[PDB]
């Protein structure tokens, strides 16, 4: 009824410990969601074309051209680690767990409140808020996954991360097909390159409507909506990282000399002349058996063209890479292609007392050593005469195509049947949790945005919309906008996310890396004297595991 509650607030985390070292992590998240009525009740096909920014030669990477359908519906997205776990929960998980499974997900909407706003004619403005007990909130769950998948973590538009702060749903939109061409250039290119928006291919048009595709529930103040429990079918996610590159695979060489006194410069020596050694190499025209030249089982990682931009029907885009840079852990300034950079607002980690439109940003440097250090690569002639001469070697300091700033490693790909690589680590709190698999016939081996990828399906998207609240002057044949009472809704959202994790075992004599509080990061986890909060980022794959 009007005065009866339809649900309970729960933002607790439960750790039920099953048999055989497994734990059943249940994460409950409850939010107060504020929803305003849409700016228009209509679907808009809008086209963006920043020809002013791209008309500057050399700015082709700043292209924003696209077409999208703008919908009156809003999306309630909880696909971010911060919606479920606070820093203590994350510390427990990443310090005590070895692997993580995604089990089930359910959500519900309860305690719906719809209000109206009326402004007086008094010369000094004043306005009052009234309940509309008969107003309804439209709710649609796309359980069949008919609508385009639009995960909000990409735009930092999921639900907030604080149980005690109200949150909002992101207005919903999806990409409408367009054709675009942009010929790249540089500062000093003669003429204006081709920079044209071509229009839309009729064979690719897809105008989706929530009304025509999803059942819609009308909720009054006494109604509730529950989705039911969806069960995932994803692969396990590892909370451990690999440090072994190809140089650390297999039996090391026997040291026929070992140091007799401890010290930095007291090295051990193999003691066998290099071309007189025993072992296996994949180089049939040399007798040198060295650490660089000895055969290894396979490859760990792969070189890829970095900051390579590829063009298709819709315009340029960056070629994605599955691993981060080498040497970035030692020097953060060297973090580059492959190290994901997140920008976010005050709902999602930025100090809440800060003023200004500038977001908080961090580049996520992962602990796994699967990257490449391109400054250390080189090609050389098949003859393999050592020491190598200038004409028989290609170094990263060597111009490709006549350019002093482009070398061979920029256009270099070594992905092959021998490549081994890991899935992307989880990123707390701004990282996406699960992603839908592409509907291509042949599927990618991994996703760069989520550690969990859904094979068959995973949960439909939850859309909300304040139902139209018309005045007495409505005329559907009028060309002007709809006359509506200023109406908005506040409703409570509760979700349950279930994980299954495996407790870790100490395999080594030494202790491992763990997340801890210290004097430096002490005040990143508590409120300020004026109530400000922040959620800094945390690394996930702390513990090391042996690759081979």
């Amino acid at each position, epitope marked *: 009824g009007v005065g009866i509650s339809t649900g309970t607030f729960n933002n607790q985390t439960e750790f039920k410990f099953l048999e055989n070292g497994w734990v059943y992590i249940t994460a409950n998240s409850s939010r107060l969601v504020h929803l305003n009525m849409p700016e228009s009740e209509n679907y808009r096909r809008v*086209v963006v*074309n920043n*020809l*002013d920014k791209t*008309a500057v030669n050399g700015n082709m990477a700043l292209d924003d051209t696209h077409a999208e359908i703008v919908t009156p519906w809003s999306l309630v997205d909880a696909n971010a680690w911060g919606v479920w776990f606070n820093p203590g929960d994350w510390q427990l998980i990443v310090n005590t767990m070895s692997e993580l499974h995604l089990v089930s997900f359910e959500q519900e909407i309860f305690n719906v409140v719809l209000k109206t706003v009326s402004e007086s004619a008094t010369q000094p403005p004043t306005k009052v808020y009234n309940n509309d007990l008969t107003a309804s909130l439209m709710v649609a769950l796309d359980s069949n996954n008919t609508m385009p998948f639009t995960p909000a973590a990409m735009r930092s538009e999921t639900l907030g991360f604080y149980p005690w702060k109200p949150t909002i749903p992101t207005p919903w939109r999806y990409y409408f097909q367009w*054709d675009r061409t942009l*010929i790249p250039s540089h500062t000093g290119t*003669s*003429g*204006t*390159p*081709t*920079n*044209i*928006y*071509h*229009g*839309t291919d009729p064979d690719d048009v897809q105008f989706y409507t929530i009304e025509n595709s999803v059942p819609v529930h009308l909720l009054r103040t006494g109604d509730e909506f529950a989705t039911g429990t969806f069960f995932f079918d994803c692969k396990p996610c590892r909370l451990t990282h690999t440090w072994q590159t190809n140089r650390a695979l297999g039996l090391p060489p026997f040291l026929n000399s070992l140091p007799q006194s401890e010290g930095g410069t007291n090295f051990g020596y193999i003691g066998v002349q290099q071309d007189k050694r025993r072992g296996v190499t994949q180089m049939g025209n040399t007798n040198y058996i060295t650490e660089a030249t000895i055969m290894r089982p396979a490859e760990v990682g792969y070189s890829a063209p970095y900051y390579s931009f590829e063009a298709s029907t819709q315009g340029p885009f960056k070629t994605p890479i599955a691993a981060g840079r080498g040497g970035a852990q030692t020097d953060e300034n060297q973090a580059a292609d492959g190290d994901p950079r997140y920008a976010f607002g005050r709902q999602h980690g930025q100090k809440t007392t800060t003023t200004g439109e500038t977001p908080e940003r961090f580049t996520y440097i992962a602990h796994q050593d699967t990257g490449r250090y391109p400054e250390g690569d080189w090609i050389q002639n098949i003859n393999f005469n050592l020491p190598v001469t200038d004409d028989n070697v290609l170094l990263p300091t060597d111009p490709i195509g006549g350019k002093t700033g482009i070398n061979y490693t920029n256009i270099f790909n070594t992905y092959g049947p021998l490549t081994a690589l890991n899935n992307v680590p989880p990123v707390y709190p701004n990282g996406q949790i699960w992603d839908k698999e592409f509907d291509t016939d042949l599927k990618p081996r991994l996703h760069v945005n989520a550690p969990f990828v859904c094979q068959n399906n995973c949960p439909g998207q939850l859309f909300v919309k304040v139902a139209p609240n018309l005045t007495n002057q409505y005329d559907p044949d009028a060309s002007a906008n709809m006359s509506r009472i200023v109406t908005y809704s506040d409703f409570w959202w509760k979700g349950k996310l279930v994980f299954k994790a495996k407790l870790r075992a100490s395999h080594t004599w030494n202790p491992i890396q763990q997340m801890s509080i210290n004097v430096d990061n002490q005040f990143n986890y508590v409120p300020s004297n004026i109530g400000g909060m922040k959620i800094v980022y945390e690394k996930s794959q702390l513990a090391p595991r042996k690759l081979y």
Partner: antibody
Amino acid sequence: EVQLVESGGDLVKPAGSLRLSCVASGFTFSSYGMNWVRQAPGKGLQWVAGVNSGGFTGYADAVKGRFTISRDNAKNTVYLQMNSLTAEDTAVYYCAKDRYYCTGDYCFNLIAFGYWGQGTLVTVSS
Amino acid sequence: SVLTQPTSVSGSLGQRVTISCSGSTNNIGIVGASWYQQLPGKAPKLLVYSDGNRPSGVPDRFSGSNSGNSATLTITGLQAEDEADYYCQSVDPTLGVVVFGGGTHLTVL
């Protein structure tokens, strides 16, 4: 090779109306826009109007309130309708094709005529 | 919006010729000019695109460039084939109006 042929020239009174037509061939007609550019005797070229695949049109400020242009992709034909003609409209009108593929509402951001017809004469006088 | 061209330009056989077209940030500063050739009484012919490319069969003699709000057409190795009239064409994206220049007559000496 691309080829265009125009028609419809005539002499009309200083306040009459007239209609012109071009026929095209040799390319994907629906993918490229078609334009009407005129040249007064002894003067330079002047743009009149253009129409794209979906029927969207653009008119110069000199003819925006008077003229009308249309297509028929099933017939590879483009028409121009002129109303309330004045003496200044006297010129030879040339029918041309765009180099760039544009179809819908958001054209006229990049235009470059790559093939041309033969032209037809329009004379406005008593 | 209208483009500006010099009335005439003169060059001698074997020399270099330059024709200049001036516009604004609204027309040429975003979409560069495209150059056309018109023999007396004949239909125009495109010579250089806005990006410096030429239609198939156009000699490399013809070239173009864009700087700020002005564009130029350069004819190298002027031959007797080049005695004609030339026009600069640009489109205004703000208004959606195609703009031609006033035209320039080329004299070969």
